[PDB]
Amino acid sequence: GAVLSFHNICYRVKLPVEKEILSNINGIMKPGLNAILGPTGGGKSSLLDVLAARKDPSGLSGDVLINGAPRPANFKCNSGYVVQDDVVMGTLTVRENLQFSAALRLATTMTNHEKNERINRVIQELGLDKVADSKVGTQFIRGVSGGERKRTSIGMELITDPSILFLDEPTTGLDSSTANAVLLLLKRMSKQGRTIIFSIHQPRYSIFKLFDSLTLLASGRLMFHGPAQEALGYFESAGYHCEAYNNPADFFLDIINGDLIEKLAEIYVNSSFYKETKAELHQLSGYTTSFCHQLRWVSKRSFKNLLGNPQASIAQIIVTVVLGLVIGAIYFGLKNDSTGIQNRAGVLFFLTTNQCFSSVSAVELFVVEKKLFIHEYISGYYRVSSYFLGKLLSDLLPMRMLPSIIFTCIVYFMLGLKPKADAFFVMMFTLMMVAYSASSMALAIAAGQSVVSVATLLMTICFVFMMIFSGLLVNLTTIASWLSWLQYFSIPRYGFTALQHNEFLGQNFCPGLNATGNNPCNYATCTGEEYLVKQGIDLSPWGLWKNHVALACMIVIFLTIAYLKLLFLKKY
């Protein structure tokens, strides 16, 4: 098996206040089962991220060396890593998660039969054969238990057959017998020859008896490294008395807590386990798949997540149908009189600002899947471009095509707007474009963040500063010229101007008029063009289509900003 042998690791971060969180740590990890103990504030998870190259090589100041050689560039694609909180797809089943991982991690050369036999072998080694085709589970659907979720998360990284297998906290978040079952599974894996390296948090003695090698850390300093049976005898030789009926790992943490660390670290420097470790270390020292493949599998997984998550996709269509029927019931039969201007301008304003505010629910998209994106980009399933285009083609495109089609098909013929063939399609296309543009601004603000609330609030602030310049509330010509340049940044202004220019052309709003008051008395606003001029809207068809080309340019700019915020994200 592999022998991961790290020597003289110094590590430091910038919080810019610079601080070392690993001081001077060396150790050898045999084929077998290696554990890392310590407090939460100690460097256990930090050293585990360092050995798997999950933290940046800028702060790292020592050689990490496997089997006599430094770590190659293919190492992250070769060595599996299992996150603390499970990153499995809750809506997909256990076999389709392994199908996804086998499709992206393994080569394109292999047969589907070979990958299916590999998945069957991995799901046989885990004991997930009873639940091989059930869903993993979310809030709405009941699913598989938590220990078998953890076995699924291990089995996703077992597909590529890793030589070294890392594990961040496999015990925590679980109950006791569940944790014992997971660790017995890990011991059955380690007896084969696979080198398991894991960090944990306050284990039991039934856990602690299984360990092959131990590494204790405290406040960034190495406290012990050797065989795990030898550790209690070493701390008896240090002078700390162990009491009867006490867990030795709890005794190890009780040494740290003080019933000092610079006093206790130097005691390990004067050990027999330290000179032997240096005597071993100085002996040793002195993409895969194409683009369309990744886009196809990412889009397939995200669309299957969209189907398997019923409520957040169905309820938007239900509220769209209900609100379309309500707007068809309120504005039913739009007349041509003095109320016609107010009713038509009001319903077009409601439809555009409805599209904008209903596109706030795409903040959720790149924020819920953020840790899964980071883990699967470091583990090397996909590029950022394929993730981005697949998740636009999967979750953004149909869930913004369907509500605008439903709004136009419902509120068009109940209201009785301009009864032409092409005005219907221009209205449908304008609602679709304002939906895409508002949702693209949502993705531009929301991408690369961890919380939903600040991005949602900022979307709503931007929309209430856009709807002032939309054109119904204020007249755009009466804004002062040092402030009227902000009307070009606003998506409802383009959607609403396009709908007003679509609908107000052939209409007359003074019945029985036939020039009674001599082109009626200069204050009438009778024909639709006379309304559409004094709003500041052009009458030429470029005055229609420049709104759509402005929306298309805002879609392109906002999706490019979202892509750059995903690409320039701190992945480590």
Ligand X SMILES: CC(C)C[C@H]1c2[nH]c3cc(OC4CCCC4)ccc3c2C[C@H]2C(=O)N[C@@H](CCC(=O)OC(C)(C)C)C(=O)N21
Residues making contact with ligand X (CB under 6 A): 315-316, 319, 323, 350, 353-354, 357-358, 360-361, 457, 460-461, 464, 467, 473
Phi, psi of 215 (to 5 degrees): -140, 110
- Interactions with a second copy, residue window 242-271 (CB under 8 A): 242-248, 250, 253-254, 257-258
Long-range contacts of 287-293 (CB under 8 A, 24+ apart): 287/380, 287/382, 287/383, 288/77, 288/105, 288/106, 288/107, 288/108, 288/380, 289/104, 289/107, 289/108, 290/108, 291/383, 291/385, 291/386, 293/103, 293/104, 293/108
**Is 278 annotated as a binding-site member?**
no
Between 81 and 349, whose beta carbon lies closer to a second copy? Answer: 349
β-bridge partners, 166: 81, 197
Any binding-site annotation on 72? no
Among ligand X, a second copy, none, the one that 250 touches (CB under a kind-dependent 5 to 8 A) is a second copy
- Cα–chain center distance at 227: 39
Smallest distance, a second copy to C-beta of residue 41, A: 9
Total binding residues for a second copy by CB under 8 A? Answer: 66
Is the Cβ of residue 80 or residue 220 nearer to a second copy in the bound state? Answer: 220
181 or 569: CB nearest a second copy: 181
In this chain, which of 238, 330, 384, 423 binds a second copy, going by CB under 8 A? Answer: 330
326 binds, among a second copy, ligand X, none (CB under 5 to 8 A by kind): a second copy
Buried b or exposed e, range 178-208, using 16+ CB within 10 angstroms: bbbbbbebbeebbeeebbbbbbbbbbeeebb
| Annotated binding-site residue? 43 | yes
* Spatial distance between the Cα atoms of 22 and 4, rounded to a whole number of angstroms: 18
Please choose which of a second copy, ligand X, none residue 316 contacts, taking the beta carbon within 5 to 8 angstroms, the exact cut-off set by kind: ligand X
User: Which string of x and - marks every residue 344-383 that binds a second copy (by CB under 8 A)?
Assistant: --xx-xx---x--x--------------------------
Is residue 17 close enough to count as binding a second copy by CB under 8 A?
no
Residue type, 432: M
Please pick, from the candidates 314, 325, 474, 549, the single residue that binds a second copy as defined by CB under 8 A. Answer: 474
Q: Is 37 helix (H, G, I), strand (E, B) or coil?
A: strand
564, two tokens: 């750059």
Does 188 show up as a binding residue in the annotation? no
Tell whether 369 is in a known binding site: no
Residue from 58, 311, 338, 508 in contact with a second copy (CB under 8 A): 338
Alpha carbon of residue 341 to chain centroid:
45
* 213-218 β-sheet, strand order: 80-82, 164-168, 195-199, 33-37, 213-218, 221-227
Nearer to a second copy, 39 or 380 (CB): 39
Asked if residue 286 belongs to a known ligand binding site, the reply is: no
Could you tell me which of 365, 387, 363 has the C-alpha nearest to residue 374?
387
Q: Is 448 annotated as a binding residue?
A: no
Beta pairing partners, 497:
none
Q: Which does 84 bind (CB under 5 to 8 A by kind): ligand X, a second copy, none?
A: none
- In this structure, are residues 554 and 491 in contact, taking their beta carbons and an 8 Å threshold? yes
Q: Is 200 a binder of a second copy (CB under 8 A)?
A: no
Q: Which does 75 bind (CB under 5 to 8 A by kind): ligand X, a second copy, none?
A: none
CA distance 395 to 440: 12
Q: How far is the CB of 312 from ligand X (least distance, A)?
A: 7
**Which DSSP string do the residues of 327-371 spell out, in sequence order?**
HHHHT-S--SSTTHHHHHHHHHHHHHHHHHHHTTTTSSHHHHTHH
For residues 349 and 329, give the distance between their C-alpha atoms in angstroms, rounded to a whole number.
17
Asked whether residue 543 is marked as a ligand-binding residue, the answer is no
Instruction: Of 307, 305, 228, give the one whose Cα is nearest residue 32.
Output: 228
Task: Flag whether 193 is marked binding.
Answer: no
Among 112, 145, 177, 285, binds a second copy (CB under 8 A): 177
Q: 358 is in the binding site of which of a second copy, ligand X, none (Cβ under 5 to 8 A by kind)?
A: ligand X
| Residue 489 binds a second copy, judged by CB under 8 A | no
Which residue in 165, 200, 218, 472 binds a second copy (CB under 8 A)?
472
The DSSP bridge partners found for residue 164 are: 195
* Those residues with Cβ within 8 angstroms of residue 557's Cβ, 6 or more apart along the chain or in another chain: none
Residue 164, SS3? strand
Q: Considering the complex, state which of residue 322 and residue 552 has its C-beta at the smaller distance from a second copy.
A: 322
Binds 321: which of ligand X, a second copy, none (CB < 5-8 Å by kind):
none
Selection from 227, 236, 235 nearest residue 208 by Cα: 227
Binding residues for a second copy restricted to 533-552, rule: CB under 8 A: 534
Residue closer to a second copy, measured from CB, 486 or 557: 486
**Using CB under 8 A as the criterion, which residues of the chain lie in contact with a second copy when the complex forms?**
39-40, 175-177, 180, 202, 204-206, 232, 242-248, 250, 253-254, 257-258, 326-327, 329-332, 335, 338-339, 342-343, 346-347, 349-350, 354, 357, 464-465, 468-469, 472-475, 477-480, 483, 510, 513, 516-518, 520-526, 534
Binding-site residue ranges for ATP: 38-45, 142-148, 169, 201
Binding-site residue ranges: 38-45, 142-148, 169, 201
